[PDB]
A paper describes a structure:
MINDY1 and MINDY2 are members of the MINDY family of deubiquitinases (DUBs) that have exquisite specificity for cleaving K48-polyUb, yet we have a poor understanding of their catalytic mechanism. Here, we analyze the crystal structures of MINDY1 and MINDY2 alone and in complex with monoUb, di-, and penta-K48-polyUb, identifying 5 distinct Ub binding sites in the catalytic domain that explain how these DUBs sense both Ub chain length and linkage type to cleave K48-polyUb chains. The activity of MINDY1/2 is inhibited by the Cys-loop, and we find that substrate interaction relieves autoinhibition to activate these DUBs. We also find that MINDY1/2 use a non-canonical catalytic triad composed of Cys-His-Thr.
Based on these observations, we predict that P138 modulates the dynamics of the Cys loop, as it provides rigidity to the loop by anchoring itself into the hydrophobic pocket. Hence, the mutation of P138 to alanine should dislodge the hydrophobic pocket interactions and result in a more dynamic, flexible loop. To test this possibility, we determined the crystal structures of the MINDY1 P138A mutant on its own and in complex with K48-Ub2. As hypothesized, the absence of P138 results in a less-extensive engagement with the hydrophobic pocket, resulting in a more mobile Cys loop, as suggested by higher b-factors of its residues. In contrast to the WT enzyme, the P138A mutant was readily modified by UbPrg, thereby supporting our notion that the P138A mutation makes the Cys loop more flexible to reduce the steric hinderance to Ub binding. Next, we determined enzyme kinetics using fluorescently labeled K48-linked pentaUb, which revealed that MINDY1 P138A mutant is a much more active enzyme with >10-fold higher kcat and ∼3-fold lower Km compared to MINDY1 WT. The consequence of a more flexible loop is also underscored by the ability of MINDY1 P138A to cleave diUb, which MINDY1 WT is unable to cleave. Importantly, increasing Cys loop flexibility and thereby catalytic activity with the P138A mutation does not change the linkage specificity of MINDY1 for K48 chains, as the mutant only cleaves K48 chains and no other linkage type. The P138A mutation, which increases the mobility of the Cys loop not only enables transition to the active conformation but also facilitates Ub binding as evidenced by lower Km for pentaUb and binding to diUb.
Residue numbers in the entry:
A (entry chain D): 1 to 76
B (entry chain A): 108 to 370
C (entry chain H): 1 to 74
Write the structure that this text describes.
């Protein structure tokens, strides 16, 4: 299954996942491609933040769905 | 120095005494350094004279000791359960100070953040926590679109508005979006003005601007930020950076807030 | 867009950049204007070091911002 992750800058990240994948898994994949730490990532879909312990299937995220990635404000 | 756990110590002549401040080489420990530099400047934690290098572990240990030594203001034998809870949850977030501390600013006031354990670390130590990311009143649309929303709420709001049928919401989304783009470095002129008036003369505080935490003070009605970048380690005369505009065009000063130079 | 780079000597360097430019690119532009090798350059904005590999946009560096140029650690 292939899904899309849009940032606020307009950039889009393509991901290869499975309905059984946890939100934590997806965040790990986002770290592999962008280097953003999972704990700074907040994923949004159909008006709700996606919780780490739930699956894509739990949120009814099917192929070619678009999620929105927003970052927490972290001062390094 | 080069290693992430190590930090170069800078000795400066602060109020009649050789006093240490910690410099930063890489991104991540800004919050830890902002707090510890306050403690060092207040002489609440003290280092061996001409100590040159210091570790995250050390800084954490000093900070741990200070936090756990704080006493409740009520100073009453009865109750005080609320205080101990604060202490516990602050000790839990403490490691994040070294790696990157999350904050959720409110664009309504210089002290407005969502109250979280992260914020509680500053509260316990009696250290004010500030930002200057304030929506200007002069712009009515930004004040209504942004409202009382935190950064975290505003970004979701934008997503919703982007998808909404209601053309009023679409419009609000675009104004809020515009506000975040133009104020992306997270300090507005209104915020800088409000912060300059709010901050207390001679008081040390932490300032969150552009995904960074700085040690801030006010001297003769003017804001200053402690220079911590290790690029300035050898520059004894470069201690305080002036904060009188949003574009980064600052004046450097020595320990006593007198203009310095290298020519 | 235009940014400014202040040295400790008091000298100001004007640059033509884009938000998408990496810190590397900017250092190269400084090496075109002045004698200074990129690997001797350390760029700071609002008290924080700008790391190679990130963009101006990553650090929210808008037009007519002032950066500070100092000498590199490593
Ligand atoms: Cl030592
Ligand atoms: Cl005052
Ligand atoms: Na979209
Ligand atoms: Na402004
Ligand atoms: Na103080
Ligand atoms: Na100056």
């Amino acid at each position: 299954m292939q899904i899309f992750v849009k940032t606020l800058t307009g950039k889009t990240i393509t991901l290869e996942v499975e309905p059984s994948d946890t939100i934590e898994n997806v965040k790990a994949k986002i770290q592999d491609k962008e280097g953003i730490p999972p704990d700074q990532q907040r994923l949004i879909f159909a008006g709700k933040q996606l919780e780490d312990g739930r699956t894509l299937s739990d949120y009814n995220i099917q192929k070619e769905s678009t999620l929105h990635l927003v970052l927490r404000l972290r001062g390094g | 120095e080069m290693e992430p756990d190590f930090y170069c110590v800078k000795w400066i002549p602060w109020k009649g005494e050789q006093t240490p401040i910690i410099t930063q080489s890489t991104n991540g420990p800004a919050a830890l350094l902002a707090i510890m530099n306050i403690l060092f400047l207040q002489w609440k934690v003290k280092l061996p004279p001409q100590k040159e290098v210091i570790t995250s572990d050390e800084l954490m240990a000093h900070l741990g000791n200070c936090l756990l030594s704080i006493k409740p203001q009520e100073k009453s034998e009865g109750l005080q359960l609320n205080f101990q809870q604060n202490v516990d949850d602050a000790m839990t977030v403490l490691p994040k100070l070294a790696t990157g501390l999350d904050v959720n600013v409110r664009f309504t006031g210089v002290s407005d953040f969502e109250y979280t354990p992260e914020c509680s670390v500053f509260d316990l130590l009696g250290i004010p926590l500030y930002h200057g990311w304030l929506v200007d009143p002069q712009s009515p649309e930004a004040v209504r679109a942004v409202g009382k929303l935190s950064y975290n709420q505003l970004v979701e709001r934008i997503i919703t508005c982007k998808h909404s049928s209601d053309t009023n919401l679409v419009t609000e989304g675009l104004i809020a979006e515009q506000f975040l783009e133009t104020t992306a470095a997270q300090l507005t002129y209104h915020g800088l003005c409000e912060l300059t008036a709010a901050a207390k003369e001679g008081e040390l505080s932490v300032f969150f601007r552009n995904n960074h935490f700085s040690t801030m003070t006010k001297h003769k009605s003017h804001l200053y930020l402690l220079v911590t970048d290790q690029g300035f380690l050898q520059e004894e005369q470069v201690v305080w950076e002036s904060l009188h505009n949003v574009d980064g065009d600052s004046c450097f000063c020595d320990s006593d807030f007198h203009l310095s130079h290298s020519l």
